[model samples]
Target: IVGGYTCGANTVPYQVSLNSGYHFCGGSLINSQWVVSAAHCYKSGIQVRLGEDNINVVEGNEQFISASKSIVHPSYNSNTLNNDIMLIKLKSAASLNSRVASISLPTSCASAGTQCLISGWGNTKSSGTSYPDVLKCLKAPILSDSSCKSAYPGQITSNMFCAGYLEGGKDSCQGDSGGPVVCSGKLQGIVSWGSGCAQKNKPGVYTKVCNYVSWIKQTIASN
Candidate 1:
């Protein structure tokens, strides 16, 4: 287990590890009982490794929580990458500590065009490699509905949002599915899909977190 610490844009507060040595990105704490993450990450069986940094040896003091069950958004479309959100029900509650604190979720409407942060351990460059041990974050402004619609006309959906760097050097790539896109310390979206990553006129798309509050709450209530 790893020790807890304050979450920053570049920090990966939690890691989901599988028996095969594969790992996925996750968000900070929400209530010491839950952690928000992408639904795709749970598609494969995984264990939430919290309060640790080294992907290798366990820190011994960290908590290794098994996922009791996963409730993915019902509308999630793996074919087109729609509604790709999910929540992990930790079999045991996380400890309340500075290094293990949870982040808040957005409940109200978000401004159409706002700058936000998106982080992951995915491929940094379109054809390059992802960071091995460190979490990477990039700044992306929330794109208006018109801009997003015009950019990827066929892929745009009501439950999705768009964000990316226009200069085309930053993006979320494969292996980053299900990470968080946060604004004002609240979750704005979940990493979804994009066109080849970091390509011109192809911004990264995400599942809008606000649009699925009811589904999330209901899933939590049932499970």
Candidate 2:
């Protein structure tokens, strides 16, 4: 993530890396067998690496598990970037521990200006190519629906919201999609899209997790 600091080892135990051979997207463990991520991050043959703090080192606590299935939101539109949430079922249940655990979903929507933290292994540079080996995190605030609409013009839907500086700098980057944005230790947002990494008047857009709580529970219970 751009303009962020390194996360302490196992500080974000709920955070997991999505990959085939290498890190691509970030996800949150919501349960022993399910992970929440962005629909756009899905790919064939992807694996979910749990208890990972850094991709460069062999942490020994990490578990590489194959994905059994990916359930992307049916309303997800690539062009509009709406309904970007997704759930991945693991081939086997993750053994929860201090270094690996689940994050609670938001019970209610986070209001505007609510303090939040987003973390990922995405680009650190907004204008150039760079990715962190160690996980990075940035502190951002939830922008109101009206403010986000004003910023993105009719493109910001109910499923999406903005979180970051309006004047810009410190935001999730290109490859951070599907990463968690937590508020008070609850998963409130999923890094979905943005105009540019930490840009002026363009805060990072995210999938409003509160709106999909029922879908999450239903999916998990049925599957």
Candidate 3:
């Protein structure tokens, strides 16, 4: 993530590397077998790495598991990026430990102005093509829906929300898609898309997780 710092090891146990041949996206482990990410981040041959702090090197506690299924939300819209959430069921359940665990899903919507934390291996600058070898994290505050709408007129939807700074300088960038946006210790949103990284008045847009709680439950139950 742009303007982010390397995270302390194992501080974010639920953070995962969504790799399709190579690391392309980030995800969060919501359960022993289910990982939540952005639908737009999907790629064939996707695998997940948990308990990982660095993408370039494997740690002793890291577990790389194949995906048994990748279920994109039926209502996901590629054009508008609405309902951008997706679920990846692992071939085997993760063995939870201090360095590998699941994050708690939000029971209700996140409030505007609440500060949240985002973590990923995305670029450090908007123009950079290289992603950080180590995981990075930053704090961003949720913007009001009205303010967010003003930033991206006709683009924001009920299923979507916005976070980051109006002044810019900090945000999730390319390669950070599908990462977790944790607020108040709960998983609130997923890094879906954004306008040119950390641009002025253009905060990062995310999939509102609370809006799809029922869908997530159903998808997990049936799949």
Candidate 4:
């Protein structure tokens, strides 16, 4: 996250890192075995690391588990990136602890102007690569649909929304896809796409998480 602050160890326990060799994508643990993430981050043989604070060091408070299944949205569009949400079922349930737990899902879509917290182990540079060893977070406000539409014109879809300053500075970037965008402790959005890292007039776009509650419930039930 560009222009974001490093989070203290386990401050945001719901955050999880995808892949084992490196931080490929970020996600939120919604339940013991279910993780909410971006469809674009989906891949076979993904290993999730829970309760991780630093990606470069073993903090002794993390759980490493291979993915049991990755269910991407049936209607997901890659070229347009619409319906970009995904769910990953774990091979084993994460044992809940002081440093590992789940975050509740949002009841409704976040309204415009709502301030939300986004945490991830993504890059901190807007123009180049700079992945952080420690997790970083930023506070940004949700923007109106009209504003988002104006910012991206035909690219913004009903399934997506924008959050961050139109003038740039702070945002979720590379390696942050599938990360959490929590507002009031509820998972409201997932980092999906953006023009670039913290670019002016290009706020980060996220999956409208509240729109997928039913799908998430049924997917878990059937699997």
For residues 1-223, what per-residue lDDT tens digits would candidate 3 score against the true structure?
9988889887999999988778999999999999999999887788899998877787688999999999999999899999999999999999999998999988999999999999999888976676788889999999999989999999999998999999999999998899999999899999999899988999999999999889988889998
Estimate every model's Cα lDDT from 0 to 1.
0.67, 0.92, 0.92, 0.92
Which sections of candidate 1 miss by over 4 Å? 1-20, 25-28, 57-61
Q: How large is the C-alpha RMSD of every model relative to the true structure?
A: 4.4, 0.9, 0.9, 0.8
List the pairs of residues colliding in candidate 4: none
lDDT of 4 by residue, 99-174 (tens): 9889998788879999999999889999988889999999999999998999999898889999999989989999
Backbone clashes in candidate 3 total 0
The candidate 2 region of ten consecutive residues with least summed lDDT is: 51-60
RMSD of model 4 against the true structure:
0.8
**TM-score of every model versus the real structure:** 0.84, 0.98, 0.98, 0.98
- Which runs in model 2 stand beyond 4 Å of their true positions? none
Q: TM-score of model 2 relative to the true fold?
A: 0.98
Candidate that beats the other on lDDT, 3 or 4, i.e. the better one: 4
Instruction: Write the residue-wise lDDT of candidate 1 on 29-129 in tens digits.
Output: 45666666666666555577666554555655467777676777777677877777778777888876645556667886467778877766566657655
Candidate 1 local distance difference test against the native: 0.67
